[PDB]
Amino acid sequence: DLKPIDVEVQAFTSASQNISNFTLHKYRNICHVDTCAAHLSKSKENKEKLQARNLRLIVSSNEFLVVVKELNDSTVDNVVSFNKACAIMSAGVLKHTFDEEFDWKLSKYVKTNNTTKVIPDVKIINRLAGQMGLSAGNPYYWMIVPGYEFLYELYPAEVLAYTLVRLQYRKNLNIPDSMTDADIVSSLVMKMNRIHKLEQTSFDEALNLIGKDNVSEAYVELARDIGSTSKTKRNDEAILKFRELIASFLPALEADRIA
Amino acid sequence: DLKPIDVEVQAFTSASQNISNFTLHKYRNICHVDTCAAHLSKSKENKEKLQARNLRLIVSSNEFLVVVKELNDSTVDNVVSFNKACAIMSAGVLKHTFDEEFDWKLSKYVKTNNTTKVIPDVKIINRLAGQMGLSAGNPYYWMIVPGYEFLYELYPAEVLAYTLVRLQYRKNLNIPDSMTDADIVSSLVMKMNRIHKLEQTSFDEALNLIGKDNVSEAYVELARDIGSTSKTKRNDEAILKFRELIASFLPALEADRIA
Amino acid sequence: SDLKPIDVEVQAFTSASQNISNFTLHKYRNICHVDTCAAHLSKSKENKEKLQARNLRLIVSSNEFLVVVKELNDSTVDNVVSFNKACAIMSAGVLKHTFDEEFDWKLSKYVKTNNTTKVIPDVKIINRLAGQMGLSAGNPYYWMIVPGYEFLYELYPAEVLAYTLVRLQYRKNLNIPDSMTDADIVSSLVMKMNRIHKLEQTSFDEALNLIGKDNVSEAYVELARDIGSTSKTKRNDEAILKFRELIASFLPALEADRIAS
Amino acid sequence: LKPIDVEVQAFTSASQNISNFTLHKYRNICHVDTCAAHLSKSKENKEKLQARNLRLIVSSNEFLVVVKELNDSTVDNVVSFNKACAIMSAGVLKHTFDEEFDWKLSKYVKTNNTTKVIPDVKIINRLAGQMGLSAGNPYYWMIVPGYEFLYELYPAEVLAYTLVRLQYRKNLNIPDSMTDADIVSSLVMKMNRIHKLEQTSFDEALNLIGKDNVSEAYVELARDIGSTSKTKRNDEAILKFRELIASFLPALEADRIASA
């Protein structure tokens, strides 16, 4: 009566799991600097378009990336998330603005040996870095991008310092209160757990390996010009006066209510 | 399978933004009312299409608009951004639902003179206005659109009152919590800043030029039905009333226990 | 010339484009064979488990079946329904033979139910949900204790509200999770009451007096009379207390283990 | 919509009959890697079970017919989903747990095995993974549906896992639709059968099996969760990060003085 269907044995293995071993080291030379800087300068609009369609971004005469929403995870190297796309392109630019990068086998910063010395076009503007008070030409300019946390494997002290700046200067950076302090650091802490094995390693050990003085120097540079523009003050003054208006309206709100 | 759109490389520069003057007064008569109301009722789907291609929107038998993303906005009169397009079509409907508009020469509202009496087709639905508790036929119905802030130059007290409502009832309107309170008012403040010159003018001076009584009239109208619409207040009232009922029944319950 | 824009044809968004048809139990009043619908209801837990994997076809009489599905794809089709609507339709089919009266909203009163054939639900079919409240087979309320019962408000408002009252009061006795706020308990009923009573322009006391607070109280007394505890539920509650006692005992050993690591 | 037909079959007092189920009737039916492979597909077997009864071949000599709970039988090889998973789990754990319980001696005797078998370490248990276990852990294949039936063989280990489920229910993605009593009810039912809890105390039961054994297993399982918690790492990070930012005040003032 039970009429059972046969179920063939088929174990769940690593082959059936998500093999996401993403490293920026497989993408170090795919950018034409001014091209990837341009794509990064349009990160807001690229994200708006990504809501509707997948994107194809040409990054050099020899390479392109296919940008997806993460749910479309694929082993194919040049199919990537939005944050991975942004990190890959930023790495292509920062190769020419940061003199040093991290060697995890030597546990130290080493010189980035760059055959070709290229200056990113100083006329390409990064609105995210401009909100911080950074100006075009700053070496950190093209690090202020979505998914910057993936850069931790190349520039750990610089990436952590920016995360620290986001944590301290929430309000100057227009970060919503919906974002807890954990929301700010969680992406970075995932990257740090991958490299440092935080289950078996402490945060003190990780921070001393990359060097707190390195983090200190980057934090000072990134925080130097954070503040408020005239627009940010006008918006803050408006909110306070708009709530004044809302308050002065309640007599008439309850009067219309009685009727 | 992923069908990606090609994204043309075009860097953001200081020349990227049209800082050019925009006045709704050169678009006052281009709409056939029900046609523009029909486009506005599809604002969500038009924006999705706009990510892939520019849009040609026929607004009457004499006029059309070319819709582009913001960085492609032009001095060309019929090439407009998404928000300007929606504002233009909203003004075309609102000229037949709002009796008065603002004259900045005379610092007062004047009567809108309409050759033709036209009622917007009450069967065209504004999903955005339903979220706020407005029903079709309400004179404010087709002001609840993207880029409504551009309407400030015609209906300043009404536009401000809606902004006040968006600030106070953000959660009721299911505004994403990714948006700060400054995000909610920024667009309006920018338009108020161009017209009132808020670097040499006070918010109080601006608010008394348009009239705090007028803002109050409109705030009461728009705020009225959000309150009576709150799912959360109905449920809270119910919980208290329900517990009052349970207290009512305790004598009957004890009497039943004895029998 | 270079913008090359695509043409967008005018096509207004209407109520034809929303299409939320009004669901009424009045279009399903005679589709049940009583013992068949009570049996489907007696397996609501297992029907719900099966719906996670596949859509369901439930035969309700020799002339009718329902197709139960998760999140109706704008189902305008009458026989294609949600789990809660399917459960309410089958519950109404049974309660037509156990409740003597139903509500007439044009008369604002309860009226007699026109039943030519009086059928007794098979008393051997057990409702585990009603048994958890302390109800016994044969109770007229037995097959009201079902998922999606709130839809029955349009036929039995005072009985549906009274059950909601028992759920709100006796959370703990009825194994209701803390993840369910008190609003979560009443929200579906309040949506039904809003649709019928127009609660934007009517008070809760207006609504409660039209259906009748004495009607609510009679039903509340019936449903709350036998609320209590089984030996099993005290065992679980004692187990939870002792288990936490153990967890506290072990905090020395866990701290000792962590610094060692 | 391709609906499945659901046969009408009322729930009665007949639908469930209390019947003795002992894992001791099934101790040698598994080929270890085969049962581990079935357990590794527990989620997919459950989805299949909603539509059809399943036949699972567990060795070259044996198979189980898996049915929904109300179709459970006294027939040995017709079993519920939870019983099937527990039978296959005991088959794997016989070669990973060194000791099992003797309820006539009221203590853990040694598991004697003719053949030394190691479960294929490349078969993955997804639910043991989110708990923070890694393949090769002796507890790896206890983290299965219906594990509570294993109390008959590994009472301290089963109780310890139930303890971890109660405390760290958020870390283990346990649905919040479940009460704390939902988490322990199945274990208490089995504890009630063996210990006669109406005429026995919990304290009596836990002393028979040994509170020391329970603690040992509890610490093992609880430590792997702690180190695994994403929320905990983020909280630690924020504390360390606030300290670091305070560290930088002298360097910041030095830069503020240079800027002026």
Author numbering:
A (entry chain B), B (entry chain D): 52 to 310
C (entry chain C): 51 to 311
D (entry chain A): 53 to 312
Which text from the study accompanies this structure?
Like all bunyaviruses, FMV has a segmented, negative-sense, single-stranded RNA (ssRNA) genome that is encapsulated by the viral nucleoprotein (N). Here, we present high-resolution crystal structures of FMV N in its RNA-free and RNA-bound forms, revealing a “paper fortune teller” structural transition between the two states. In general, N proteins of bunyaviruses consist of a globular core that includes the RNA binding cleft and two terminal arms (N and C arms) that enable oligomerization. The N protein serves as the main building block for the RNP assembly, protects the viral genome from endo- and exonucleases, and helps to evade the host’s innate immune response.
The trypsin-treated N protein (NΔN45) was then purified and screened for crystallization conditions. Finally, the structure was refined against a 2.28-Å-resolution data set with excellent statistics. The crystal structure of RNA-free NΔN45 revealed four NΔN45 molecules in the asymmetric unit that were organized in a tight tetramer, as was previously reported for N proteins from other members of the Bunyavirales order. Each of the monomers comprised an N-terminal arm (N arm, residues 52 to 71), a globular core (residues 71 to 280), and an α-helical C-terminal arm (C arm, residues 281 to 313). The N arm was mostly a coiled loop that contained a short β-strand (strand A), followed by the N-terminal subdomain (N lobe) of the globular core, which encompassed three α-helices (α1 to α3), and the BCD β-sheet, which was inserted between α2 and α3. The C-terminal subdomain of the core (C lobe) consisted of helices α4 through α10 and was followed by the C arm, a 33-residue-long amphipathic α-helix. The putative RNA binding cleft, a positively charged trench, was formed between the N and C lobes, and as expected, it did not contain any RNA molecules. Interestingly, unlike other bunyaviruses’ nucleoproteins, the FMV N presented one disulfide bond between C82 and C87 that was observed in all four copies of the asymmetric unit (bottom). The FMV N tetramer was organized as two dimers with 2-fold symmetry rather than having a 4-fold symmetry. Each protomer (N0) interacted with two other protomers via its N arm, which interacted with the N−1 protomer, and its C arm, which interacted with the N+1 protomer.
